[PDB]
Design a protein around this ligand. Structure first.
Ligand code: NAP
Ligand code: NAP
Ligand code: NAP
Ligand code: NAP
Ligand code: DX8
Ligand code: DX8
Ligand code: DX8
Ligand code: DX8
Lengths: 248, 249, 249, 249
């Protein structure tokens, strides 16, 4: 029987490349999405064309609220309903925007940034464990200790996620569930970003003066879920071309 | 004129010793508390007996919610209302209890553990900076954040987020002359509801003296970070753990 | 043409497992050894028996001394002499024994513990880079470097230095397309001098399976780092420790 | 009786300020020096003018060699000879220069850079602890250890080794009541050799004030750690970097 994976925010960019590479490895995939219905569906049809009945989609908002635990439970439940098992959880979905200290209310920013980056991964982890080569892979950030100016909530969420990865690895090890992170430095830059600002970041990267492809990020996820990683838990693998090593 | 400090969860235990030492150093103090009303008032009484009009209490629930921004604004506002200034913020208040992955709802556990340990400190930092000498913030972190207690994921998540806040806020507020630092206990005053057997188990693990830090030892490190002897320290987290975090399994 | 790799201390245990797996991946291999001549020649025989002219041995002491740079240069030269290229360097060889602060002279212990774990890796890295596609270096580190064993200060100093080299060399050799990474075991193959009981005590502290890593499990992570699947990875140290580093005292 | 302290490389710059501040706090001091005889004696004169027979100088090369262990044993002995006790050791002396991977032989650079930054502090630590069975050791580390200067592999290896020594020694010496901590400057007094324009490039990177730390700001952190206010603190490394290490490329 083919194993199954849930990948959150899988419609586009890194999460898409993760879903694709997992599918190519032989995984059936639950493609979670929030706003990107058309892209999520186009991905599912592409993958089902490859092998029928191997891809489904799951819509949920991952903002923190009093319904988020039920939403996260439902996303895990969807994988079991589609595929009768859930072997891999990838916490990829992420809100990302500045929140300076000095039109969204602040409580909404907290809900979105802490919810997507930290609380939803925690609830999903809970649901995943309660329902049981099992592992969870969290998309972290190589630059968590050298954060972007005015990104306190985002950075707090990514720091929290490190704590989740470590705490869950310890707690779930007896159940044989491994929990690891992949930490991009600069990968796919925002779509709006002018090439000239993209280049300011690219130039900082020691290995090649370029950003990671989504596929390069996905390669590290693939390693962490594979049988080549079966003693690996609580580890966060930077995929950053040495960017985090560069002083000011 | 005397500087003023806000200390959250300052009615008992470590927050209280921090409040007292700040007061002995010359600070007027806002004693924030949540449930410990009697203890809060008793401390203000004590401190005001020593120097009149140098201590006030301020009640707030620091659980995460849509009104938490208002509560945090009001804590900082109460420092200005009492003392005309706010020089020091100490983020001490914290919920601490297990939340295993396998009688409160999970929603409530998220709100309390993430609210008190991370979100309220962020909002307090925001309100503090916006109302702005030697200005600084001290966050009560955890020396064991990368070697966490089993089944404490939400607690450990909040303390990890707090590290991120300390670093992010240090960077962003440095242009305003506001320093932001941490003090990270290993084992200090042990939980009231911890059994004496577990207490002694923790004590035996500490290389330096086989005992927990007194509240006053933790407070001493807070005092250093807010002092003139720390004017170039920002984004630093000082472990006060007697070497506990260095001890392998 | 098949790529070529140098593995230090490759005669036995983890070094052998990396050498074997690299060879199974299609590398030709320089099996470096110090005292274990028979085991190193036995491995080379086995590997050549699988594919003719794909393995050679190379004897060298990696203790620090004024000729260590010539020795390390010679190890790289040996790979080029045998195979006409050198694609991968794995720094595995390591002295490991206690050096309490309170029959070897202390200067010999420094030379052996710092030489094998840090200086030789640095000299080999220099020689490797100077002689230069998927070029990389992998350094066998220690997951427990921040939670060290009692009385192993020089060994721990050496492994910490190795972390700095990993990061320093990743930064400086990135323009040359040489990636530099580490793999950090927790407990893998226990020391042969360790009795089963002391072995079991270590085994029992591992959250993931309560067992040590097989030599193969360590080799799997080396194989990933040198692969095309890790082409953007440099300066990273991958723990392969079953959660051991996360477990508090 | 007044306590006594050893400060290595104490003739100038940061080591000088540490020595002055320790003396002002009431310590008698051993001023160690290698080349700076004139300056070491000048500081001695100034301190002894303040309180008679409270400062002595001590000459040693701290480069790694066969005689280094004897040299370090003698630095510690000089403190006992002068003052009948040795309460504090500050490992400040340091060689600092590039050693690109791709003048001095490389083994001489290993000897100086790893010797001064790591091996000498290890040997001094041994000699300090042995003569015992508020004692502490403070090591001068580097806030930028994980974001090193380009082409400074050996230096960076030495400072990483020093972090390892700090933690290993804290663990091993805790049962003796000897605390072991570090202070990690970012940019303080810029190297005299450094060009003026490059000095200003570094200053402008510092979030807190866009300036370097004075030597006295570094010393302030040393003073805290050796004080009774840091009595539960061991294995801690306090950054004094004005946020510098927080700033991304
Ligand atoms: N790209 C980089 O340079 C970089 C660098 C460091 C770390 N990372 C991390 O790597 C991961 C992938 O990065 P990325 O650039 O591919 O991410 P991204 O495009 O910025 O976001 C990924 C997806 O997250 C989902 N999302 C946002 N808000 C949500 C909400 N409220 N509820 C549910 N889903 C929500 C979105 O789904 P919909 O489109 O369906 O609405 C989005 O497509 C992220 O975790 C990120 O933090 C990336
Ligand atoms: N004690 C240790 O060994 C240790 C170890 C590591 C880290 N720390 C950290 O050091 C700090 C002080 O430790 P501690 O043991 O003194 O803390 P504590 O007694 O467990 O908590 C301090 C105060 O936090 C307040 N608090 C809890 N929930 C709150 C809420 N929902 N809203 C507002 N306030 C709330 C409580 O105030 P009221 O009583 O008024 O209700 C409580 O007295 C904490 O941040 C802790 O995480 C302590
Ligand atoms: N075993 C574990 O649980 C564990 C845990 C953490 C890290 N590690 C790291 O992983 C790596 C492999 O571990 P291991 O247990 O397989 O190592 P090991 O058996 O203790 O040592 C591997 C080889 O190092 C070589 N070596 C020792 N001194 C040397 C010298 N002066 N000059 C040249 N070579 C010398 C020896 O070669 P000869 O036999 O030919 O003389 C030895 O076979 C090491 O770097 C180790 O520090 C292992
Ligand atoms: N200044 C900074 O921005 C900065 C930044 C990060 C870390 N640090 C650390 O803080 C400490 C003080 O820095 P600094 O700039 O004051 O240091 P420094 O001037 O570069 O060196 C201090 C002293 O070290 C002694 N020294 C050098 N080589 C020696 C050897 N082979 N044997 C014995 N002594 C030797 C010298 O003594 P003699 O003059 O008597 O020959 C020198 O005056 C150092 O450990 C340094 O790495 C400083
Ligand atoms: C301080 O360095 C960085 C650089 C990029 C990022 C980064 N994080 C992101 N998270 C999401 N969800 N989407 C993104 O595009 C990014 C991103 C970038 N670029 C974070 C820290
Ligand atoms: C894994 O080691 C520890 C030990 C103690 C603690 C700890 N955190 C606390 N937070 C609050 N608010 N109150 C406490 O008593 C503690 C506590 C302890 N003990 C955390 C991690
Ligand atoms: C604190 O946990 C550990 C456990 C094992 C080791 C360890 N390091 C070694 N290095 C060499 N060269 N050979 C070994 O066998 C080990 C070893 C073990 N076990 C170090 C720290
Ligand atoms: C990457 O940022 C830095 C900044 C300063 C230093 C630094 N290290 C030193 N060591 C000695 N012995 N003397 C020095 O002046 C410095 C120094 C500087 N500046 C190192 C790394």
């Amino acid at each position: 029987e083919a194993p199954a994976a849930v990948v959150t925010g899988a419609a586009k960019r890194i999460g898409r490349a993760i879903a694709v590479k997992l599918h190519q490895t032989g995984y059936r995939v639950v493609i979670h999405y929030h706003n990107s219905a058309e892209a999520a569906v186009s991905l599912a049809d592409e993958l089902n064309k490859e092998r029928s009945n191997t891809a489904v989609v799951c819509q949920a908002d991952l903002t923190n609220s009093n319904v988020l635990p039920a939403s996260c439970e439902e996303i895990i439940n969807s994988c079991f309903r589609a595929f009768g098992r859930c072997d891999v959880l990838v916490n990829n979905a992420s809100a990302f925007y500045p929140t300076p200290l000095v039109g969204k209310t602040v409580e909404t920013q907290v809900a979105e940034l802490i919810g997507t980056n930290a609380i939803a991964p925690f609830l999903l982890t809970m649901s995943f464990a309660q329902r049981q080569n099992l592992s969870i892979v969290n998309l972290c950030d190589a630059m968590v200790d050298q954060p972007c100016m005015a990104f306190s909530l985002y950075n707090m969420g990514k720091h929290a996620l490190v704590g989740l990865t470590q705490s869950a690895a310890l707690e779930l090890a007896p159940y044989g569930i491994r929990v690891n992170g992949v930490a991009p430095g600069v990968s796919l830059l925002p779509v709006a970003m002018g090439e000239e600002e993209k280049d300011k970041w690219r130039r900082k990267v020691p290995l090649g003066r370029r950003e990671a492809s989504a596929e390069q990020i996905a390669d590290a996820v693939i390693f962490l879920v594979s049988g080549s990683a079966q003693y690996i838990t609580g580890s966060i693998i930077k995929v950053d071309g040495g960017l985090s090593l560069v002083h000011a």
